[PDB]
């Protein structure tokens, strides 16, 4: 369908799961949004300050954190590895999981997160340097699993203890074709959480597509209200909800800002 409509969406209107296994390139994605005063860096700086505030300034701590739809990225776990003993990274895409495993073993061919790590280190008061912080995160990531938000058991039949937190960054908008699927995916992740467990979500507002170069992928256009309502219906109580008006470059997405939320599983 070239560029009229997102890839894998001609039939259903939304990018199909197998499009993420076939046309999602981890290296390309990382080079597009995570190299670094672009729109992409300003959003990543906001994302990092929010994760720093949630995990380090606020009481978002425990033993196990599960990251849902991690992709090939690790920026979302930097501040979290300070409050959680264990972290499980998950994604639907095996090529994404392989990119994480390169980084986990500090393979020379893995993506360089050094600028991002230095930035989280400066935010955190410079108690440690970049290489020390990287090793603490690497040591905290205990599992790298296959994930599928649309399944009642998202991690398949992998026995895991109940988690104290479930973090999901820029995944749910890309994975859920409508509000009922979005609500059901929030219920599915709740099955991984202890009662009173934390749900941390950060995603785009009113975006119908996002790009990896010239490959167009679907996004669920959500407003502030629809996210609030779907989170509440899924069995959660919102602790806090933030909305930034900052959007990605016009050549990469049509988002009208982003949101951050901390909710509690009822
Ligand atoms: N049904 C599904 N279940 C779980 N993850 C899914 C999914 N469909 C798509 N995804 C994943 O959702 C991600 C969207 S990109 C988000 C990457 C990363 N967390 C970040 O913040 O940059 C992709 O890595 C894709 O593989
Ligand atoms: C890094 N980006 C930019 C982006 C921009 C607008 C919408 C969406 C995204 N997503 C996935 C979720 C949907 C990403 N992963």
Curated annotation (Swiss-Prot):
Pathway(s) per entry? Cofactor metabolism; Amino-acid degradation
What reaction(s) does this enzyme catalyze? nicotinamide + S-adenosyl-L-methionine = 1-methylnicotinamide + S-adenosyl-L-homocysteine
Q: Give residues annotated as binding S-adenosyl-L-methionine.
A: 29, 34, 69, 75, 91, 96, 148-149, 169
Residues recorded with modification Citrulline: 27, 138, 187
Residues given in the record as nicotinamide binding sites:
203, 219
Predominant location category: cytoplasm
Keywords (A to Z) from UniProt = Acetylation, Citrullination, Cytoplasm, Methyltransferase, S-adenosyl-L-methionine, Transferase
Where in or outside the cell? Answer: Cytoplasm
Q: Which PROSITE patterns match?
A: NNMT_PNMT_TEMT, SAM_MT_NNMT_PNMT_TEMT
Recall the GO molecular function terms of this protein's record: nicotinamide N-methyltransferase activity; pyridine N-methyltransferase activity
- Quote the CDD domains the UniProt record gives: AdoMet_MTases
**Activity modulation comment:** Inactivated by deimination on Arg-138.
- Please state the Enzyme Commission number of this protein: 2.1.1.1
What domain of life is recorded for the organism? Eukaryota
Q: What Pfam families does its record include?
A: NNMT_PNMT_TEMT
On tissue specificity, the annotation reads: Predominantly expressed in the liver. A lower expression is seen in the kidney, lung, skeletal muscle, placenta and heart. Not detected in the brain or pancreas.
Under the heading SUPFAM superfamilies, the entry gives:
S-adenosyl-L-methionine-dependent methyltransferases (SSF53335)
Effect caused by changing residue 219 to A: Has no effect on N-methyltransferase activity
Any one of the GO BP annotations: positive regulation of protein deacetylation
For this chain, the Swiss-Prot or TrEMBL PTM comment says: Deiminated by PADI1 and PADI2.
Note, other: Prominently expressed in the stroma of high-grade serous carcinomas. In tumorigenesis, regulates the epigenetic reprograming of cancer cells associated with increased cell migration and metastasis.
Its job: Catalyzes the N-methylation of nicotinamide using the universal methyl donor S-adenosyl-L-methionine to form N1-methylnicotinamide and S-adenosyl-L-homocysteine, a predominant nicotinamide/vitamin B3 clearance pathway. Plays a central role in regulating cellular methylation potential, by consuming S-adenosyl-L-methionine and limiting its availability for other methyltransferases. Actively mediates genome-wide epigenetic and transcriptional changes through hypomethylation of repressive chromatin marks, such as H3K27me3.
Q: PANTHER family, from UniProt?
A: NICOTINAMIDE N-METHYLTRANSFERASE, NNMT/PNMT/TEMT FAMILY MEMBER
Which family does this protein fall into? Belongs to the class I-like SAM-binding methyltransferase superfamily. NNMT/PNMT/TEMT family.
Name of the protein: Nicotinamide N-methyltransferase
Q: What is the originating organism of this protein? A: Homo sapiens (Human)
| Gene encoding the protein | NNMT
């Amino acid at each position: 369908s070239s560029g009229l409509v997102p890839r894998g969406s001609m039939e259903s209107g939304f990018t199909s799961k197998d499009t993420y296994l076939s046309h999602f390139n981890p290296r390309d994605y990382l080079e597009k949004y995570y190299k670094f005063h672009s729109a992409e860096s300003q959003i990543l700086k906001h994302l990092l300050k929010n994760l720093f505030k949630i995990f380090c300034l606020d009481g978002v701590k425990g033993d196990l954190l599960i990251d849902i739809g991690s992709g090939p990225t690790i920026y979302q776990l930097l501040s979290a590895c300070e409050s959680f003993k264990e972290i499980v990274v998950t994604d639907y895409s095996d090529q994404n999981l392989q990119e994480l495993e390169k980084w986990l073993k500090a393979a020379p061919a893995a993506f360089d997160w050094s600028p991002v790590v230095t930035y989280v280190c400066d935010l955190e008061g410079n108690r440690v340097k970049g290489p020390e912080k990287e090793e603490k995160l690497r040591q905290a990531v205990k599992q790298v699993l296959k994930c599928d938000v649309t399944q009642s058991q998202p991690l398949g039949a992998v026995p895991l203890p109940p988690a104290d937190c479930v973090l999901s960054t820029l995944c749910l908008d890309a994975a859920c074709p409508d509000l009922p699927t979005y609500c059901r995916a929030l219920r599915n992740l709740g099955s991984l959480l202890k009662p009173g467990g934390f749900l941390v979500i950060m995603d785009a507002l009113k975006s119908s597509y996002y790009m990896i170069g010239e490959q167009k992928f679907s996004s669920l256009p959500l407003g502030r209200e629809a996210v609030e309502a779907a989170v509440k219906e899924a069995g959660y109580t919102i602790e806090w909800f933030e909305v930034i008006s900052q959007s990605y470059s016009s050549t990469m997405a049509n988002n009208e800002g982003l949101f951050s939320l901390v909710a509690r599983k009822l």
